[PDB]
Write a protein that binds this ligand. Structure first.
Ligand code: VO7
Length: 273
């Protein structure tokens, strides 16, 4: 096993200016270390603290264009996570809100980017366990990143072997990648809407899966179906998913059928301490 020499930066509370509440608490704000203003998100009992420090550990250990980056922690009254602000929100809200504006090219490119980040996480021998459209953040419509590592080592995103046997592999992640692509292609529909979680186990054993989304050629829907094989080893590899969705993004409309187809500010992606 190789030593994890990731650095953990600890930040002064007086370096932040919380701008407003993003959700509840996670705030939006500016981090001023150097003549630079970094736009950031800021996540504010003993069990609670042990679980945010776990997230910092994972996030400080990853470095990839399609994974979310830690900027630091702050050790005040509670623990604060400081990450890069993704100004367009999570991808689930974004497809819901811009239903009538997403082109086939954007959808296929997101599937490539999410698969690229998952492939990176496999490189780093790391299992996400909570891949979902709600946990993919949008930096620009052109650039998305995987986030939320509270489970890194939800019934309706889990491989069947995870529901039955509490078994998680990179191939159980590919199953969740499958469900996540289906969220995108249905513009934010809820997987198994109405179906109570207690039932998901037996349904999947009976051979049923999520249905073909309307904009989806059989080419795209067959890739989702392959992510849902009961035999984990028969599921596609995250690196084959990159290849396949890449070839599709070269000709998006053959595969997705859609009607109508502040002065010293620096994105965290350009602050490379
Ligand atoms: C889908 C929920 C969401 O994330 N919405 C969101 C996110 C950001 N930017 C951002 N950047 C990095 C991390 C986070 C983050 C981490 N946990 C949470 C929890 C709640 C909200 C954000 C979180 N977020 C936005 O920047 C402007 C906006 C935004 N929106 C659109 C809020 C939508 N609902 C959830 C309030």
């Amino acid at each position: 096993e190789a030593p994890n020499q990731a650095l953990l930066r600890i930040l002064k509370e007086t370096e932040f200016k919380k701008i407003k509440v993003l959700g509840s608490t996670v705030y939006k704000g500016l981090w001023i270390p150097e003549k630079v203003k970094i736009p950031v998100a800021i996540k504010e009992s003993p069990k609670a603290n042990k679980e945010i420090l776990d997230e910092a550990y994972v996030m400080a250990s990853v470095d990839n264009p399609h994974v979310c980056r830690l900027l630091g922690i702050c050790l005040t009254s509670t623990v604060q996570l400081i990450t890069q602000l993704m100004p367009f929100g999570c991808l689930l809200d974004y497809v819901r809100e811009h239903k009538d504006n997403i082109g086939s090219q954007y959808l296929l490119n997101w599937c490539v980017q999410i698969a690229k980040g998952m492939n990176y996480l496999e490189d780093r021998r790391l299992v996400h366990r909570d891949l979902a459209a709600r946990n993919v953040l949008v930096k620009t419509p052109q650039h998305v990143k995987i986030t939320d590592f509270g489970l890194a080592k939800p019934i309706k995103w889990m491989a069947l072997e995870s529901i039955l046997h509490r078994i998680y592999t990179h191939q159980s992640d590919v199953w969740s990648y499958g469900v996540t692509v289906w969220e995108l292609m249905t513009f934010g529909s809820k997987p198994y809407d109405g179906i109570p979680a207690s039932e998901i186990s037996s349904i999947l054993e009976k051979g049923e899966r999520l249905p073909q989304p309307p904009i989806c050629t059989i080419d795209v829907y067959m890739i989702m179906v392959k992510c849902w094989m009961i035999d984990a080893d028969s599921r596609p590899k995250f690196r084959e998913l990159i290849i396949e969705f890449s070839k599709m993004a070269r000709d998006p409309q053959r595969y997705l059928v859609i009607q109508g187809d502040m002065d010293d500010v620096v994105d965290a992606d350009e602050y490379l301490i």
